[PDB]
Design a protein around this ligand. Structure first.
Ligand SMILES: O=C(O)CNC(=O)C(=O)O
Ligand SMILES: [Mg+2]
Ligand code: NI
Ligand SMILES: [Zn+2]
Length: 331
């Protein structure tokens, strides 16, 4: 078995190897990359996502989210308070203000220590989940707006044509902005490109051990667990590496820098935080190996998780017994 310790693997494809996206994902899996839940891909030196970032300031963040924490430093939830619209140039100036900027630090490890010590005492503002793309249309390789769609994958594997579309999303971050512990909708893959700015630190649990994280979360968030049998789908719970280590949960960590891709694999729980002002692009995707994870994915029916139009068909075809109850939650 390849990668039996479930380490995060880092790949350096050549420009020739960067032509065929599906083939490269399958290659990484042949080497055991999926066992970690997360892999890093450093693009060939010849490749670029676009020519420059000089003209992005007029993108609108219609609904910036202030991430307010409750709990203790290592075990907390966050809720999202909606704020007034602002442009990316306005948000960048806010991120660089004395109130929101990255503090002085020695290295990524010192910064990580400061994040876990101090996160709960501040409420950073995240420009998350903005439909759009920063890849130039002429970028032919690993262009996250030109991937094969999940609906087409389901049709190719299973023969059933379904409605729905699959488009990318932009994320504008600042120091301490946080992504809570989750797997993707329908336990899909994700791919995330850090277009510019400061790093993003990731934590990940191997897919084979995901239920260990779920059991800990039920213990640590006991009211939330009674409320919903899949409350991590709400994307609100944070648990620190120190608390994971105290409770014996297998995990790994890595820091993504500008110019790098990350891939999350089906049922790979992940969480993390931004180091400072940045912009990332991400989208879900599927391969043949996902289908069995999609069939088994948990679902929130309490009504809180409220997701996309395209997830309807995935539930209806892959999970017909659950369909009814899950749709009651969605309506
Ligand atoms: O970058 C973020 O805030 C969150 N991204 C992801 O969870 C992802 O790409 O799957
Ligand atoms: Mg602009
Ligand atoms: Ni994710
Ligand atoms: Zn729920």
């Amino acid at each position: 078995a390849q990668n039996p310790n479930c380490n995060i693997m880092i790949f350096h494809p050549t420009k020739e190897e960067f032509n065929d996206f599906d083939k490269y994902i399958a290659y990484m899996e042949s080497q055991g990359a999926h066992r970690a839940g997360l892999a890093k891909i450093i693009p060939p030196k010849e490749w670029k996502a676009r020519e420059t970032y000089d003209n992005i300031s007029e993108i609108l963040i219609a609904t910036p989210l202030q991430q307010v924490a409750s709990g203790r430093a290592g075990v907390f939830t966050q809720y999202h308070k909606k704020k007034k619209a602002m442009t990316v140039g306005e948000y960048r100036h806010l991120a660089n203000s004395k109130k929101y900027q990255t503090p002085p630090h020695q290295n990524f490890e010192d910064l990580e220590r400061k994040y876990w010590k101090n996160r709960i005492y501040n409420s950073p503002i995240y420009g998350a989940d903005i439909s759009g793309s920063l890849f130039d249309e002429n970028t032919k390789q690993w262009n996250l707006g030109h991937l094969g769609t999940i609906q087409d994958l389901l049709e190719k594997e299973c023969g059933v044509v379904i409605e729905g579309v699959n488009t990318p999303y932009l994320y504008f971050g600042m120091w301490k902005t946080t992504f809570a512990w989750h797997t993707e909708d329908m336990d899909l893959y994700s791919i995330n490109y850090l277009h510019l700015g400061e790093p993003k630190t990731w934590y990940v649990v191997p897919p084979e051990h995901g239920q260990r994280l779920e059991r800990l979360a039920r213990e640590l968030f006991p009211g939330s667990s009674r409320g919903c049998g899949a409350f991590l789908r709400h994307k609100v719970a944070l648990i620190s590496p120190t608390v994971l280590k105290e409770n014996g949960i297998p995990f790994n960590r890595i820091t993504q820098e500008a110019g790098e891709f990350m891939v999350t694999f089906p049922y790979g729980y992940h969480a993390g935080f931004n180091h400072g002002f940045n912009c990332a692009e991400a989208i879900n995707f599927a391969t043949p190996r996902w289908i069995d994870y999609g069939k088994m994915a948990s679902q929130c029916s309490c009504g809180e998780a409220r997701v996309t139009f395209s997830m309807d068909a995935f539930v209806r075809i892959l999970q017909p017994e659950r369909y009814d109850l899950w749709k009651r939650g969605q309506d």
